[PDB]
Amino acid sequence: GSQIPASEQETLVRPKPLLLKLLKSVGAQKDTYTMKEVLFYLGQYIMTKRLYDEKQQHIVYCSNDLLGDLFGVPSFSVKEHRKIYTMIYRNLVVVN
């Protein structure tokens, strides 16, 4: 949560095909993204599709959704910051 450095938002990534499919439904297509962008587009995907129950323990429900196949989970909490970064990282390649 608070032990995640700000520098993490600047990491450059090439999404794997399924994460890219998902990103293409909410943002401009491109080869390389920042982590800031991947987080904003994933957030926008979830909110637009009404996958997130805010006043219900802050859980994203994704078992009826491609997001679920991407993450390998039926649901998760937006408070599980390290978990989320990990599930995202497994769906992309870091570039440098």
Ligand X SMILES: COC[C@@H](C)c1nc2cc(-c3noc(=O)[nH]3)nc(-c3cncc(Cl)c3)c2n1[C@H](C)[C@H]1CC[C@H](C)CC1
User: Which residue of this chain has its Cβ atom nearest to ligand X in the complex?
Assistant: 43
**Could you say which of 19, 42, 70, 92 contacts ligand X (CB under 6 A)?**
42
Q: How far is the CB of 30 from ligand X (least distance, A)?
A: 18
Q: Which is nearer to ligand X, 14 or 89 (CB)?
A: 89
Q: Does 39 bind ligand X (CB under 6 A)?
A: yes
Candidate ranges 17-25, 26-34, 36-44; the one touching ligand X (CB under 6 A): 36-44
Task: Residue 72: name the closest of 27, 18, 31 by CA.
Answer: 18
Q: Does 95 bind ligand X (CB under 6 A)?
A: no
Burial class of residue 42 (count of CB atoms within 10 Å of its CB; 0-12, 13-18, 19+): buried
Q: Which is nearer to ligand X, 9 or 14 (CB)?
A: 9
Query: What Å distances lie between residue 80 and 14, 17, 24, CA to CA?
Result: 23, 24, 25
1, 81 Cβ separation under 8 angstroms: yes
Cα angle vertex 80, ends 75, 83, to 5°?
A: 80
**Could you say which of 43, 65, 66, 73 contacts ligand X (CB under 6 A)?**
43
